[PDB]
Amino acid sequence: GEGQAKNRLFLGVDLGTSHTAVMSSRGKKFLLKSVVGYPKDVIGLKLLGRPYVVGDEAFEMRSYLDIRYPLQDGVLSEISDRDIEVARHLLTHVVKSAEPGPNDEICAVIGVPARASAANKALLLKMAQEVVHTALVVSEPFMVGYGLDKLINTIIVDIGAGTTDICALKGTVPGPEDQVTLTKAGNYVDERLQNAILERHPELQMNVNVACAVKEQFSFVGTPTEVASFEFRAAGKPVRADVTEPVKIACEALMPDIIESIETLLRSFQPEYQDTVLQNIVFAGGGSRIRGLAAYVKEKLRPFGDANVTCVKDPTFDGCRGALRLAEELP
Ligand SMILES: Nc1ncnc2c1ncn2[C@@H]1O[C@H](COP(=O)(O)OP(=O)(O)NP(=O)(O)O)[C@@H](O)[C@H]1O
Ligand SMILES: [Mg+2]
């Protein structure tokens, strides 16, 4: 059985709502938008030269295409027959981009959004094993926890765009109350920030995309250590404005529900492990990049004890890195 031992390719796939991140046991590492773009008509199909395009270029060309994000920002929920085919196209493309050899047995751990129903995880598993030889579908917080060697007595706070997903890891299948989903996340910050800015600078030409740019450049919580000065437009002209306090307000607005959620999950652990849980509060997702976040949360958790809050080092790739590790380590 030399062939079978040698001709094996492992993949860690972070199959997210907005982005798919992939690492392979041979060192491939790449990122793409979780989107497939289809020609609008037969002429589009001729123009495209292929039946669909996948990833960043699908997004880039979206004005000319019918684009589909198969992990409809939830899961929201039951994935249709049509969207399972869209997911097949996405996963087929990511697996091809990992460049397997023609003799390779492709073995993939595929992380999916936390709230994906059992039925949807089963659907994605069936589809996956039509694309790769062996697959295992796991939830995102598990994959993230696994990569940190944090699978028990841990709480993962995953701050995304549409939701903040908070998961207690207890070394078992999550119970119904081991997860909390908040609707206050990055998009909500954008909205708050847009409006905090316009209150102070009504003349700026502003939308949630501009607010998002300001946020991504300057996000912080706690006492300001620098000035958030951003170069806006007003009546067509460049105008710089200090939006330190709007940024502070908008980013800090996320935190009360997060702290409340951590409390709710903390008390569901056995009492003698609660201090240990507080040493394993992990922030993930795009929102974990907010400046000052770990210290701020640590201070806000003082009523519960002395917390060690950490932010994942690389929100983009740490999930798929963990999935790859699971894939290579599992017998
Ligand atoms: N430095 C930053 N500071 C604050 N927010 C940021 C930063 N970088 C990215 N974000 C935000 O993080 C969010 C994206 O996080 P991400 O974890 O990629 O979302 P997602 O889970 O894929 N999307 P969704 O399922 O719709 O919630 C967006 O709101 C970004 O604007
Ligand atoms: Mg997310």
Side-chain angles (χ1 to χ4, degrees), residues 169-216:
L169 301 178
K170 286 170 179 169
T172 59
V173 64
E177 287 84 344
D178 287 339
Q179 295 187 281
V180 178
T181 301
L182 306 174
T183 57
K184 291 178 195 171
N187 293 343
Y188 172 81
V189 182
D190 296 346
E191 298 262 8
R192 287 301 299 279
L193 177 48
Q194 164 179 233
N195 293 350
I197 289 169
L198 283 174
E199 179 179 353
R200 295 172 180 78
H201 303 87
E203 78 285 0
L204 301 181
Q205 69 200 54
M206 178 66 55
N207 60 32
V208 282
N209 293 343
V210 175
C212 177
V214 175
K215 177 191 78 185
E216 288 187 356

mmCIF file of all heavy atoms in Angstrom, residues 169-216:
data_model
loop_
_atom_site.group_PDB
_atom_site.id
_atom_site.type_symbol
_atom_site.label_atom_id
_atom_site.label_comp_id
_atom_site.label_asym_id
_atom_site.label_seq_id
_atom_site.Cartn_x
_atom_site.Cartn_y
_atom_site.Cartn_z
ATOM 1 N N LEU A 169 -16.530 26.023 24.006
ATOM 2 C CA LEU A 169 -15.977 24.735 23.610
ATOM 3 C C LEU A 169 -15.793 23.898 24.883
ATOM 4 O O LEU A 169 -15.065 24.304 25.793
ATOM 5 C CB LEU A 169 -14.655 24.874 22.871
ATOM 6 C CG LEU A 169 -14.660 25.703 21.577
ATOM 7 C CD1 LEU A 169 -13.258 25.783 20.982
ATOM 8 C CD2 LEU A 169 -15.579 25.108 20.581
ATOM 9 N N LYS A 170 -16.425 22.723 24.906
ATOM 10 C CA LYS A 170 -16.459 21.872 26.110
ATOM 11 C C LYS A 170 -15.983 20.446 25.862
ATOM 12 O O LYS A 170 -16.144 19.575 26.720
ATOM 13 C CB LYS A 170 -17.879 21.849 26.690
ATOM 14 C CG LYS A 170 -18.268 23.177 27.416
ATOM 15 C CD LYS A 170 -19.769 23.235 27.774
ATOM 16 C CE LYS A 170 -20.100 24.529 28.500
ATOM 17 N NZ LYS A 170 -21.578 24.712 28.620
ATOM 18 N N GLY A 171 -15.366 20.227 24.704
ATOM 19 C CA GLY A 171 -14.805 18.935 24.345
ATOM 20 C C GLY A 171 -15.867 17.987 23.840
ATOM 21 O O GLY A 171 -15.621 16.791 23.711
ATOM 22 N N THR A 172 -17.050 18.530 23.561
ATOM 23 C CA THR A 172 -18.190 17.752 23.094
ATOM 24 C C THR A 172 -18.981 18.504 22.046
ATOM 25 O O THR A 172 -18.745 19.687 21.800
ATOM 26 C CB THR A 172 -19.159 17.406 24.238
ATOM 27 O OG1 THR A 172 -19.642 18.615 24.835
ATOM 28 C CG2 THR A 172 -18.475 16.547 25.291
ATOM 29 N N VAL A 173 -19.914 17.790 21.422
ATOM 30 C CA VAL A 173 -20.932 18.380 20.561
ATOM 31 C C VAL A 173 -21.609 19.539 21.305
ATOM 32 O O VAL A 173 -22.054 19.362 22.438
ATOM 33 C CB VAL A 173 -21.980 17.299 20.130
ATOM 34 C CG1 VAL A 173 -22.759 16.744 21.342
ATOM 35 C CG2 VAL A 173 -22.924 17.832 19.064
ATOM 36 N N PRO A 174 -21.653 20.737 20.696
ATOM 37 C CA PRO A 174 -22.275 21.863 21.408
ATOM 38 C C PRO A 174 -23.747 21.635 21.762
ATOM 39 O O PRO A 174 -24.512 21.144 20.936
ATOM 40 C CB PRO A 174 -22.141 23.017 20.415
ATOM 41 C CG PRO A 174 -20.960 22.657 19.568
ATOM 42 C CD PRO A 174 -20.981 21.168 19.460
ATOM 43 N N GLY A 175 -24.127 21.987 22.988
ATOM 44 C CA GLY A 175 -25.529 22.013 23.374
ATOM 45 C C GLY A 175 -26.176 23.253 22.788
ATOM 46 O O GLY A 175 -25.472 24.142 22.300
ATOM 47 N N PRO A 176 -27.515 23.335 22.838
ATOM 48 C CA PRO A 176 -28.203 24.471 22.204
ATOM 49 C C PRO A 176 -27.770 25.816 22.785
ATOM 50 O O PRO A 176 -27.614 26.790 22.049
ATOM 51 C CB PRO A 176 -29.687 24.205 22.500
ATOM 52 C CG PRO A 176 -29.768 22.767 22.891
ATOM 53 C CD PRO A 176 -28.455 22.430 23.523
ATOM 54 N N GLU A 177 -27.549 25.858 24.092
ATOM 55 C CA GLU A 177 -27.194 27.113 24.749
ATOM 56 C C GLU A 177 -25.684 27.397 24.789
ATOM 57 O O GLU A 177 -25.270 28.375 25.412
ATOM 58 C CB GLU A 177 -27.743 27.127 26.174
ATOM 59 C CG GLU A 177 -29.258 27.305 26.257
ATOM 60 C CD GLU A 177 -30.030 25.998 26.095
ATOM 61 O OE1 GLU A 177 -29.440 24.998 25.629
ATOM 62 O OE2 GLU A 177 -31.230 25.972 26.444
ATOM 63 N N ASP A 178 -24.868 26.575 24.118
ATOM 64 C CA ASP A 178 -23.421 26.785 24.095
ATOM 65 C C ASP A 178 -23.011 27.785 23.017
ATOM 66 O O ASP A 178 -21.823 28.045 22.831
ATOM 67 C CB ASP A 178 -22.685 25.477 23.866
ATOM 68 C CG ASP A 178 -22.703 24.575 25.095
ATOM 69 O OD1 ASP A 178 -22.912 25.089 26.207
ATOM 70 O OD2 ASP A 178 -22.483 23.362 24.933
ATOM 71 N N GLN A 179 -24.004 28.312 22.310
ATOM 72 C CA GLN A 179 -23.761 29.276 21.250
ATOM 73 C C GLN A 179 -24.696 30.451 21.366
ATOM 74 O O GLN A 179 -25.889 30.312 21.655
ATOM 75 C CB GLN A 179 -23.916 28.619 19.886
ATOM 76 C CG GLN A 179 -22.879 27.563 19.674
ATOM 77 C CD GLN A 179 -22.894 27.004 18.284
ATOM 78 O OE1 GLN A 179 -23.739 26.168 17.949
ATOM 79 N NE2 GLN A 179 -21.965 27.474 17.450
ATOM 80 N N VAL A 180 -24.127 31.615 21.101
ATOM 81 C CA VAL A 180 -24.851 32.861 21.115
ATOM 82 C C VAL A 180 -24.498 33.567 19.794
ATOM 83 O O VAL A 180 -23.319 33.612 19.414
ATOM 84 C CB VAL A 180 -24.463 33.727 22.315
ATOM 85 C CG1 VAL A 180 -25.214 35.054 22.283
ATOM 86 C CG2 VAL A 180 -24.744 33.011 23.641
ATOM 87 N N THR A 181 -25.519 34.045 19.088
ATOM 88 C CA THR A 181 -25.352 34.770 17.839
ATOM 89 C C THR A 181 -25.866 36.176 18.047
ATOM 90 O O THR A 181 -27.031 36.363 18.384
ATOM 91 C CB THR A 181 -26.120 34.135 16.674
ATOM 92 O OG1 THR A 181 -25.680 32.796 16.486
ATOM 93 C CG2 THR A 181 -25.883 34.919 15.379
ATOM 94 N N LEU A 182 -24.993 37.158 17.860
ATOM 95 C CA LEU A 182 -25.385 38.562 17.991
ATOM 96 C C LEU A 182 -25.475 39.167 16.617
ATOM 97 O O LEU A 182 -24.655 38.852 15.750
ATOM 98 C CB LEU A 182 -24.370 39.346 18.814
ATOM 99 C CG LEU A 182 -24.031 38.800 20.199
ATOM 100 C CD1 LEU A 182 -22.902 39.628 20.824
ATOM 101 C CD2 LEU A 182 -25.258 38.836 21.065
ATOM 102 N N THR A 183 -26.440 40.067 16.426
ATOM 103 C CA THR A 183 -26.567 40.764 15.157
ATOM 104 C C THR A 183 -25.722 42.029 15.143
ATOM 105 O O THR A 183 -25.531 42.630 14.093
ATOM 106 C CB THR A 183 -28.022 41.131 14.852
ATOM 107 O OG1 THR A 183 -28.545 41.934 15.914
ATOM 108 C CG2 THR A 183 -28.847 39.878 14.708
ATOM 109 N N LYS A 184 -25.201 42.434 16.301
ATOM 110 C CA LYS A 184 -24.247 43.543 16.334
ATOM 111 C C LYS A 184 -22.845 43.053 16.044
ATOM 112 O O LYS A 184 -22.244 42.335 16.843
ATOM 113 C CB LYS A 184 -24.254 44.253 17.668
ATOM 114 C CG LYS A 184 -25.512 45.021 17.952
ATOM 115 C CD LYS A 184 -25.434 45.662 19.334
ATOM 116 C CE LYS A 184 -26.802 46.121 19.805
ATOM 117 N NZ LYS A 184 -26.778 46.536 21.228
ATOM 118 N N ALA A 185 -22.353 43.430 14.875
ATOM 119 C CA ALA A 185 -21.010 43.091 14.444
ATOM 120 C C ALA A 185 -20.491 44.199 13.518
ATOM 121 O O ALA A 185 -20.907 45.350 13.665
ATOM 122 C CB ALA A 185 -21.009 41.720 13.755
ATOM 123 N N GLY A 186 -19.622 43.877 12.567
ATOM 124 C CA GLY A 186 -18.963 44.890 11.767
ATOM 125 C C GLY A 186 -19.904 45.807 10.991
ATOM 126 O O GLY A 186 -19.677 47.011 10.892
ATOM 127 N N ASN A 187 -20.950 45.245 10.392
ATOM 128 C CA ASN A 187 -21.893 46.065 9.617
ATOM 129 C C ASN A 187 -22.576 47.099 10.506
ATOM 130 O O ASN A 187 -22.764 48.249 10.122
ATOM 131 C CB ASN A 187 -22.957 45.187 8.950
ATOM 132 C CG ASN A 187 -22.391 44.296 7.892
ATOM 133 O OD1 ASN A 187 -21.288 44.501 7.404
ATOM 134 N ND2 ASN A 187 -23.173 43.294 7.496
ATOM 135 N N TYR A 188 -22.916 46.662 11.707
ATOM 136 C CA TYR A 188 -23.516 47.502 12.732
ATOM 137 C C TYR A 188 -22.561 48.621 13.141
ATOM 138 O O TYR A 188 -22.963 49.776 13.248
ATOM 139 C CB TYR A 188 -23.876 46.685 13.942
ATOM 140 C CG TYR A 188 -24.329 47.489 15.135
ATOM 141 C CD1 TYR A 188 -25.641 47.966 15.234
ATOM 142 C CD2 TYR A 188 -23.453 47.764 16.165
ATOM 143 C CE1 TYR A 188 -26.049 48.698 16.322
ATOM 144 C CE2 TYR A 188 -23.837 48.510 17.253
ATOM 145 C CZ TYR A 188 -25.141 48.975 17.332
ATOM 146 O OH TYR A 188 -25.525 49.698 18.427
ATOM 147 N N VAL A 189 -21.293 48.286 13.355
ATOM 148 C CA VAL A 189 -20.297 49.335 13.611
ATOM 149 C C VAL A 189 -20.259 50.356 12.471
ATOM 150 O O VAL A 189 -20.208 51.570 12.729
ATOM 151 C CB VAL A 189 -18.881 48.738 13.835
ATOM 152 C CG1 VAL A 189 -17.866 49.864 14.149
ATOM 153 C CG2 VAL A 189 -18.921 47.789 14.985
ATOM 154 N N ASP A 190 -20.293 49.882 11.226
ATOM 155 C CA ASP A 190 -20.247 50.772 10.083
ATOM 156 C C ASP A 190 -21.387 51.783 10.166
ATOM 157 O O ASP A 190 -21.191 52.990 9.926
ATOM 158 C CB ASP A 190 -20.332 50.015 8.753
ATOM 159 C CG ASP A 190 -19.153 49.087 8.506
ATOM 160 O OD1 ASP A 190 -18.127 49.194 9.220
ATOM 161 O OD2 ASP A 190 -19.269 48.238 7.576
ATOM 162 N N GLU A 191 -22.571 51.283 10.496
ATOM 163 C CA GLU A 191 -23.774 52.101 10.528
ATOM 164 C C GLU A 191 -23.672 53.134 11.612
ATOM 165 O O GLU A 191 -23.910 54.322 11.364
ATOM 166 C CB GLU A 191 -25.018 51.240 10.743
ATOM 167 C CG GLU A 191 -25.242 50.248 9.612
ATOM 168 C CD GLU A 191 -26.251 50.704 8.560
ATOM 169 O OE1 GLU A 191 -26.699 51.880 8.608
ATOM 170 O OE2 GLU A 191 -26.587 49.868 7.674
ATOM 171 N N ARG A 192 -23.324 52.681 12.812
ATOM 172 C CA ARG A 192 -23.110 53.583 13.949
ATOM 173 C C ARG A 192 -22.103 54.657 13.595
ATOM 174 O O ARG A 192 -22.306 55.835 13.894
ATOM 175 C CB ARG A 192 -22.613 52.824 15.189
ATOM 176 C CG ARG A 192 -23.674 51.962 15.886
ATOM 177 C CD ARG A 192 -24.880 52.766 16.355
ATOM 178 N NE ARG A 192 -24.527 53.798 17.335
ATOM 179 C CZ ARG A 192 -24.349 53.568 18.639
ATOM 180 N NH1 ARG A 192 -24.469 52.345 19.128
ATOM 181 N NH2 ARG A 192 -24.046 54.560 19.468
ATOM 182 N N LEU A 193 -21.014 54.248 12.955
ATOM 183 C CA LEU A 193 -19.916 55.160 12.686
ATOM 184 C C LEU A 193 -20.346 56.201 11.657
ATOM 185 O O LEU A 193 -20.069 57.397 11.819
ATOM 186 C CB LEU A 193 -18.686 54.389 12.199
ATOM 187 C CG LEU A 193 -17.464 55.226 11.812
ATOM 188 C CD1 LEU A 193 -17.143 56.264 12.894
ATOM 189 C CD2 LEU A 193 -16.252 54.337 11.555
ATOM 190 N N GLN A 194 -21.010 55.743 10.596
ATOM 191 C CA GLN A 194 -21.558 56.647 9.585
ATOM 192 C C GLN A 194 -22.350 57.759 10.241
ATOM 193 O O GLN A 194 -22.203 58.936 9.894
ATOM 194 C CB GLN A 194 -22.488 55.929 8.602
ATOM 195 C CG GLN A 194 -23.349 56.942 7.823
ATOM 196 C CD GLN A 194 -24.261 56.325 6.827
ATOM 197 O OE1 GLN A 194 -24.264 56.706 5.653
ATOM 198 N NE2 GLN A 194 -24.997 55.306 7.248
ATOM 199 N N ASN A 195 -23.213 57.374 11.175
ATOM 200 C CA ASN A 195 -24.121 58.331 11.789
ATOM 201 C C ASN A 195 -23.446 59.208 12.857
ATOM 202 O O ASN A 195 -23.816 60.375 13.024
ATOM 203 C CB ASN A 195 -25.323 57.593 12.383
ATOM 204 C CG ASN A 195 -26.217 56.946 11.293
ATOM 205 O OD1 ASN A 195 -26.050 57.194 10.094
ATOM 206 N ND2 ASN A 195 -27.171 56.134 11.719
ATOM 207 N N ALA A 196 -22.464 58.663 13.573
ATOM 208 C CA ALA A 196 -21.692 59.469 14.511
ATOM 209 C C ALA A 196 -20.854 60.517 13.787
ATOM 210 O O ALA A 196 -20.615 61.602 14.316
ATOM 211 C CB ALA A 196 -20.806 58.587 15.361
ATOM 212 N N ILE A 197 -20.398 60.190 12.584
ATOM 213 C CA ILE A 197 -19.614 61.117 11.786
ATOM 214 C C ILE A 197 -20.519 62.213 11.239
ATOM 215 O O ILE A 197 -20.187 63.396 11.318
ATOM 216 C CB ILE A 197 -18.886 60.399 10.638
ATOM 217 C CG1 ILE A 197 -17.742 59.541 11.204
ATOM 218 C CG2 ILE A 197 -18.345 61.380 9.616
ATOM 219 C CD1 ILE A 197 -17.153 58.609 10.172
ATOM 220 N N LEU A 198 -21.668 61.823 10.695
ATOM 221 C CA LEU A 198 -22.541 62.795 10.045
ATOM 222 C C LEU A 198 -23.112 63.769 11.054
ATOM 223 O O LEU A 198 -23.402 64.919 10.705
ATOM 224 C CB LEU A 198 -23.674 62.100 9.286
ATOM 225 C CG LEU A 198 -23.253 61.482 7.950
ATOM 226 C CD1 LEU A 198 -24.404 60.687 7.321
ATOM 227 C CD2 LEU A 198 -22.746 62.530 6.977
ATOM 228 N N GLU A 199 -23.259 63.325 12.303
ATOM 229 C CA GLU A 199 -23.740 64.216 13.341
ATOM 230 C C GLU A 199 -22.765 65.383 13.486
ATOM 231 O O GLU A 199 -23.179 66.528 13.658
ATOM 232 C CB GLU A 199 -23.906 63.489 14.683
ATOM 233 C CG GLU A 199 -24.385 64.415 15.818
ATOM 234 C CD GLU A 199 -24.589 63.701 17.148
ATOM 235 O OE1 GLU A 199 -24.501 62.455 17.184
ATOM 236 O OE2 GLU A 199 -24.845 64.389 18.163
ATOM 237 N N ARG A 200 -21.471 65.084 13.392
ATOM 238 C CA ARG A 200 -20.427 66.077 13.641
ATOM 239 C C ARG A 200 -19.966 66.763 12.347
ATOM 240 O O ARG A 200 -19.456 67.885 12.383
ATOM 241 C CB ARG A 200 -19.233 65.426 14.357
ATOM 242 C CG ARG A 200 -19.544 64.895 15.781
ATOM 243 C CD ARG A 200 -18.361 64.099 16.344
ATOM 244 N NE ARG A 200 -18.570 63.562 17.691
ATOM 245 C CZ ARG A 200 -19.293 62.479 17.981
ATOM 246 N NH1 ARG A 200 -19.927 61.815 17.023
ATOM 247 N NH2 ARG A 200 -19.405 62.071 19.246
ATOM 248 N N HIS A 201 -20.150 66.105 11.209
ATOM 249 C CA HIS A 201 -19.670 66.636 9.936
ATOM 250 C C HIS A 201 -20.691 66.425 8.835
ATOM 251 O O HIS A 201 -20.423 65.728 7.841
ATOM 252 C CB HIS A 201 -18.329 65.995 9.563
ATOM 253 C CG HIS A 201 -17.274 66.184 10.612
ATOM 254 N ND1 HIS A 201 -17.121 65.323 11.679
ATOM 255 C CD2 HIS A 201 -16.354 67.162 10.784
ATOM 256 C CE1 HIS A 201 -16.137 65.752 12.451
ATOM 257 N NE2 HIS A 201 -15.655 66.865 11.929
ATOM 258 N N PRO A 202 -21.856 67.078 8.980
ATOM 259 C CA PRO A 202 -22.980 66.813 8.077
ATOM 260 C C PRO A 202 -22.625 66.951 6.596
ATOM 261 O O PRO A 202 -23.322 66.371 5.762
ATOM 262 C CB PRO A 202 -24.034 67.843 8.494
ATOM 263 C CG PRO A 202 -23.405 68.745 9.486
ATOM 264 C CD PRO A 202 -22.167 68.106 9.995
ATOM 265 N N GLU A 203 -21.548 67.662 6.274
ATOM 266 C CA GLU A 203 -21.277 68.025 4.877
ATOM 267 C C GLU A 203 -20.517 66.940 4.120
ATOM 268 O O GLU A 203 -20.438 66.966 2.893
ATOM 269 C CB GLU A 203 -20.509 69.368 4.806
ATOM 270 C CG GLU A 203 -18.990 69.320 5.122
ATOM 271 C CD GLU A 203 -18.680 69.176 6.619
ATOM 272 O OE1 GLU A 203 -19.632 69.104 7.435
ATOM 273 O OE2 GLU A 203 -17.476 69.156 6.980
ATOM 274 N N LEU A 204 -19.965 65.975 4.847
ATOM 275 C CA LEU A 204 -19.180 64.922 4.210
ATOM 276 C C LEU A 204 -20.045 64.000 3.366
ATOM 277 O O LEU A 204 -21.151 63.662 3.751
ATOM 278 C CB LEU A 204 -18.449 64.097 5.263
ATOM 279 C CG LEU A 204 -17.488 64.862 6.168
ATOM 280 C CD1 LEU A 204 -16.836 63.901 7.134
ATOM 281 C CD2 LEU A 204 -16.448 65.602 5.356
ATOM 282 N N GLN A 205 -19.539 63.601 2.206
ATOM 283 C CA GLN A 205 -20.283 62.671 1.393
ATOM 284 C C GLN A 205 -19.942 61.261 1.922
ATOM 285 O O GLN A 205 -18.790 60.804 1.914
ATOM 286 C CB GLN A 205 -20.008 62.888 -0.101
ATOM 287 C CG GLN A 205 -18.627 62.546 -0.651
ATOM 288 C CD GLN A 205 -18.315 63.264 -2.012
ATOM 289 O OE1 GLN A 205 -18.408 64.494 -2.130
ATOM 290 N NE2 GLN A 205 -17.925 62.483 -3.021
ATOM 291 N N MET A 206 -20.979 60.612 2.440
ATOM 292 C CA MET A 206 -20.832 59.480 3.354
ATOM 293 C C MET A 206 -21.782 58.349 3.014
ATOM 294 O O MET A 206 -22.957 58.590 2.752
ATOM 295 C CB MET A 206 -21.125 59.930 4.788
ATOM 296 C CG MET A 206 -21.058 58.817 5.816
ATOM 297 S SD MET A 206 -19.402 58.113 6.031
ATOM 298 C CE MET A 206 -18.520 59.626 6.400
ATOM 299 N N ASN A 207 -21.271 57.123 3.059
ATOM 300 C CA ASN A 207 -22.111 55.926 3.052
ATOM 301 C C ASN A 207 -21.450 54.853 3.936
ATOM 302 O O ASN A 207 -20.504 55.168 4.663
ATOM 303 C CB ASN A 207 -22.359 55.452 1.629
ATOM 304 C CG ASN A 207 -21.095 55.101 0.886
ATOM 305 O OD1 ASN A 207 -20.111 54.633 1.464
ATOM 306 N ND2 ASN A 207 -21.125 55.282 -0.433
ATOM 307 N N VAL A 208 -22.019 53.640 4.004
ATOM 308 C CA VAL A 208 -21.497 52.665 4.966
ATOM 309 C C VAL A 208 -20.163 52.165 4.487
ATOM 310 O O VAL A 208 -19.381 51.670 5.296
ATOM 311 C CB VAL A 208 -22.430 51.436 5.220
ATOM 312 C CG1 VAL A 208 -23.587 51.791 6.149
ATOM 313 C CG2 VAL A 208 -22.912 50.838 3.934
ATOM 314 N N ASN A 209 -19.887 52.286 3.191
ATOM 315 C CA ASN A 209 -18.594 51.847 2.682
ATOM 316 C C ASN A 209 -17.487 52.803 3.124
ATOM 317 O O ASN A 209 -16.383 52.368 3.445
ATOM 318 C CB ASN A 209 -18.577 51.729 1.159
ATOM 319 C CG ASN A 209 -19.483 50.603 0.624
ATOM 320 O OD1 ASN A 209 -19.908 49.697 1.359
ATOM 321 N ND2 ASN A 209 -19.782 50.671 -0.676
ATOM 322 N N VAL A 210 -17.766 54.107 3.125
ATOM 323 C CA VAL A 210 -16.775 55.074 3.611
ATOM 324 C C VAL A 210 -16.536 54.859 5.101
ATOM 325 O O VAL A 210 -15.393 54.814 5.527
ATOM 326 C CB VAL A 210 -17.204 56.550 3.367
ATOM 327 C CG1 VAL A 210 -16.185 57.525 4.000
ATOM 328 C CG2 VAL A 210 -17.351 56.812 1.894
ATOM 329 N N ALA A 211 -17.611 54.740 5.879
ATOM 330 C CA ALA A 211 -17.535 54.437 7.296
ATOM 331 C C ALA A 211 -16.737 53.160 7.557
ATOM 332 O O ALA A 211 -15.928 53.098 8.500
ATOM 333 C CB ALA A 211 -18.921 54.307 7.872
ATOM 334 N N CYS A 212 -16.962 52.152 6.730
ATOM 335 C CA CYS A 212 -16.224 50.901 6.882
ATOM 336 C C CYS A 212 -14.723 51.141 6.689
ATOM 337 O O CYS A 212 -13.918 50.601 7.429
ATOM 338 C CB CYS A 212 -16.737 49.850 5.893
ATOM 339 S SG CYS A 212 -15.767 48.293 6.002
ATOM 340 N N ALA A 213 -14.349 51.971 5.708
ATOM 341 C CA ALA A 213 -12.945 52.314 5.454
ATOM 342 C C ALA A 213 -12.323 53.030 6.655
ATOM 343 O O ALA A 213 -11.161 52.797 7.000
ATOM 344 C CB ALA A 213 -12.811 53.213 4.184
ATOM 345 N N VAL A 214 -13.090 53.923 7.256
ATOM 346 C CA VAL A 214 -12.616 54.673 8.407
ATOM 347 C C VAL A 214 -12.366 53.703 9.561
ATOM 348 O O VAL A 214 -11.336 53.740 10.227
ATOM 349 C CB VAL A 214 -13.635 55.729 8.851
ATOM 350 C CG1 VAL A 214 -13.167 56.413 10.137
ATOM 351 C CG2 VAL A 214 -13.849 56.754 7.736
ATOM 352 N N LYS A 215 -13.355 52.850 9.788
ATOM 353 C CA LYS A 215 -13.273 51.785 10.792
ATOM 354 C C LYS A 215 -12.041 50.913 10.588
ATOM 355 O O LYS A 215 -11.267 50.687 11.512
ATOM 356 C CB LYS A 215 -14.535 50.957 10.724
ATOM 357 C CG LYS A 215 -14.537 49.775 11.656
ATOM 358 C CD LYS A 215 -15.692 48.830 11.350
ATOM 359 C CE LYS A 215 -15.386 47.991 10.154
ATOM 360 N NZ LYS A 215 -16.592 47.151 9.804
ATOM 361 N N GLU A 216 -11.851 50.419 9.380
ATOM 362 C CA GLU A 216 -10.767 49.481 9.124
ATOM 363 C C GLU A 216 -9.420 50.168 9.269
ATOM 364 O O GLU A 216 -8.439 49.532 9.633
ATOM 365 C CB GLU A 216 -10.922 48.830 7.741
ATOM 366 C CG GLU A 216 -12.096 47.800 7.713
ATOM 367 C CD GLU A 216 -12.197 47.006 6.439
ATOM 368 O OE1 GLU A 216 -11.411 47.290 5.512
ATOM 369 O OE2 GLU A 216 -13.110 46.146 6.327
#
